[PDB]
RNA sequence: AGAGAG
């Protein structure tokens, strides 16, 4: 499982991440949680629960070790 | 399971929530209930059954306790 | 199950619902049936079979009891 | 199962159908086949295999008995 | 199973096929193979692995035998 | 399985692929890993985790053997 | 957030 490798690191190394969404919107934050369906993003003040189905791409601040 | 503590908790506390849809359209209100597939939002007196497949992000009012 | 309650109640009541589609399009009419994948809507004497995957939000005209 | 009722009739009564798609495109034809994933449309000369996932709505030429 | 006789047959006969994507973009070519999730199209010398979730419609050259 | 062959072969060969996204967006880089849900792409020293649900087409630079 | 595909 890359996805889970990727995301748990980005989570415990508190990396800043841009989340690109399906529509083109770009969100920036830190991942504080994830399950099979959803990502929990700390992003500009707020806790936003993102549906994985609406995410296109994670562009990390610093590249992850996998 | 974060999705489900997120949703149940913002439901118990009538947190005011911004739901952003996949299309960009954004909706505002409170979650009356949810199941596997759908989120019942009240939106100023009014009921909207939203499919979660049409939902991108929950941005609640202040931060819940997970 | 909120979806099925919500949806059998609007079918029963013969409620006028706005169905916003994923593209923003809006239909209106009344529900005549559903299954796990589809909603049959009458909208001006015409039956339209809508897939639930293309639906965003059902906004009914009087809130529902569930 | 409405979906299958609907579609098998529209198929054996050779009804003309507009298929509205997720993007708004409108296609017109007769259903010559369907499986769980796909619809076979006779539509302006050609046999087009449509993915159900890309279909929003079937608007039949004459309303179906269900 | 229509999808699968459709695809295998247009693959055996290098039928020229218009694939319309979900976005409207349309692509033209021949199907080299397919699996559960993906259609290998050759498109003038060139290989494109397309996810079927990104595909709306197959419009082949003349009509195949199903 | 064509997808996994296709994709392990471009990962092996270190091929330059264009990945067209569902929105039309184009990325380019090379595949470093995949799982059943995601592709890890390096595109200019940066790792991007793309979901397969957001991918339309992988257009590689030299056709693949499968 | 009222529908004809590069």
Describe the structure.
It is classed as translation/rna. The entry lists the keywords Sm-like motif, Protein-RNA complex, TRANSLATION-RNA complex. It forms a heptameric assembly. The entry is titled "Crystal structure of YmaH (Hfq) from Bacillus subtilis in complex with an RNA aptamer". Six copies of one chain form a homohexamer. Chain A is of the alpha+beta class. Chain A has one helix at 2-12; strands at 17-21, 26-34, 38-43, 46-51, 55-60. The first copy, chain A, has one domain: SH3 type barrels. In chain A, β1 (17-21) and β2 (26-34) form a beta hairpin. Chains in contact: A-B, A-F, B-C, C-D, D-E, E-F. The interface between A and F is medium-sized, with 19 and 21 residues. β4 of chain E pairs antiparallel with β5 of chain F. Chain C binds one RNA strand of 6 nucleotides through residues 18, 20-28, 56-57.
Sequence-ordered SSE layout with sheet pairings:
The structure is a homohexamer of 66-residue chains.
Chain A: H1 2-12, E1 17-21, E2 26-34, E3 38-43, E4 46-51, E5 55-60
Antiparallel strand pairs in A: 1-2, 1-5, 2-3, 3-4
Chain C binds one RNA strand of 6 nucleotides through strand 1 and strand 2.
- State the CATH architecture of chain A: Roll
Largest interface: A-F, 19 and 21 residues
How many domains of chain A? The number is 1
Ends of chain A: how far apart? 10 Å
The gyration radius over C-alpha positions of chain A equals 11 Å
Percentage of residues in DSSP E strands of chain A: over 45%
Which fold name fills CATH's third level, the topology of chain A? SH3 type barrels
The biggest beta sheet of chain A reads: 5 strands, antiparallel
Molecular shape of chain A: globular
Roughly how much helix do the residues of chain A carry, as a percent range?
10-25%
Order of strands in the sheet with most strands of chain A? 4-3-2-1-5
CATH class value of chain A:
Mainly Beta
Structural class designation of chain A: alpha+beta
Helix-strand sequence of chain A: HEEEEE
Quaternary status: homohexamer
Number of strands of chain A: 5
Task: Count the DSSP helices of chain A.
Answer: 1
């Amino acid at each position: 499982n890359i996805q889970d490798q990727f995301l748990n690191q980005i989570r415990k190394e508190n990396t800043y991440v841009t989340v690109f969404l399906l529509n083109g919107f770009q969100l920036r934050g830190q991942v504080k949680g994830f399950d099979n369906f959803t990502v929990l993003l700390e992003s500009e003040g707020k806790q936003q629960l993102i549906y994985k189905h609406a995410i296109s791409t994670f562009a990390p601040q610093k590249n992850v070790q996998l």
